Amino acid sequence: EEDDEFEDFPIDAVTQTNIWEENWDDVEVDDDFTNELKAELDRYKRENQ
């Protein structure tokens, strides 16, 4: 049911289907952690010039 063991296939090529994200599609300023990183990169640049 739930275990990791394959259930039985019944009884009796196209290649493509790329399943890996080739290049990302997110907005970098819509992510909080990412701006705190920039925002403190500024604080460092401003000061320790």
């Binding site: 296939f9 009796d12 399943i19 990412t34």
Partner: protein, 286 residues
């Protein structure tokens, strides 16, 4: 030939070894497949038989932390299960089983899944739960990665995934982190050299509370390995893993990279960098 149920028998058997807390007994079955004679028959069995095999073989590798090793197997598995003729609600359930391992294997190797094709194999809550970890990694949020593992600990352990991630996810998360710095510091602000003091406060934001930082005092796997106070080292590994092209000046207290506006000359694409230092081909079944 007159060995038409061999693969069936093999899997049936290797599955048993997994059901007991002792899957190391598989390698001996796996090993029986490099005879020149039989390697060339593995391709003649039913495809769903090969898939199952590759699945087990893949999981085996991962148990031994051989990530790319495991990956190529999970990849061949799912790819083969996609151009599978039928679609019973078991075949898809098996594809689900495969993905539960393929997702974290790929992440470690710096690869992330296109959830499009997988929609019929996973529940949106699964997609979401990976999605959130997917970004923590992407932006270099070490503490995010920890607390995700911490939540997801228990049934990650159930699948022998808790630890491999806890060790192998960090250095990717670190690449991204330092890349964002480097980008805005040496390609946008054209600032050739990065002092450790810089990475230091970057690392504090990312890592968060460490072992006996005030508030946290029991060591735990979630706050015991990572400390911002270790700037020089997290760089040295990143460079030795080929994940970063830089230099260190221990007494000058700075990291020097090549002066350039193109980001991928200093922080190459994480995946190919790993696969180069850890090659693994697909028709080795052991």
């Amino acid at each position: 030939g007159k060995q038409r149920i061999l693969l069936y028998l093999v899997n049936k058997l290797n599955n048993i070894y997994f059901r007991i807390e002792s899957p190391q007994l598989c390698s001996n079955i796996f090993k029986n497949f490099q005879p020149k004679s039989m390697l060339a028959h593995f391709n003649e069995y039913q495809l769903d038989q090969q898939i199952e095999y590759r699945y087990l073989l893949g999981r085996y590798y991962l148990l031994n932390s051989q990530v790319h090793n495991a990956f190529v197997q999970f990849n061949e598995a799912f790819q083969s299960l996609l151009n599978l003729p039928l679609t019973n609600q078991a075949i898809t359930r098996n594809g689900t089983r495969i993905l539960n391992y393929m997702i974290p294997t790929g992440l470690i190797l710096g690869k992330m899944v296109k959830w499009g094709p997988l929609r019929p194999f996973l529940s949106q809550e699964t997609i979401d739960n990976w999605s959130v970890l997917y970004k923590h990694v992407r932006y270099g949020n070490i503490q995010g990665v920890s607390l995700w593992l911490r939540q997801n600990e228990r049934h990650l352990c159930a699948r022998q995934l808790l630890i491999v991630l806890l060790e192998k996810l960090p250095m990717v998360t670190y690449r991204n982190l330092i890349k964002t710095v480097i980008k805005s510091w040496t390609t946008e602000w054209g600032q050739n050299k990065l002092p450790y003091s810089l990475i230091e406060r970057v690392l504090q934001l990312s890592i968060g509370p460490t072992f006996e930082d005030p508030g946290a005092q029991e060591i735990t796997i979630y706050n015991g390995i990572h400390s911002p106070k270790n700037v020089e080292n997290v760089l040295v590994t990143l460079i030795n893993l080929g994940l970063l092209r830089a230099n260190c000046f221990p007494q000058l207290q700075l990291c020097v990279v090549k002066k350039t506006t193109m980001i991928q000359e200093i922080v190459p694409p994480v995946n190919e960098r790993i696969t180069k230092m850890f090659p693994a081909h697909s028709h080795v079944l052991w």
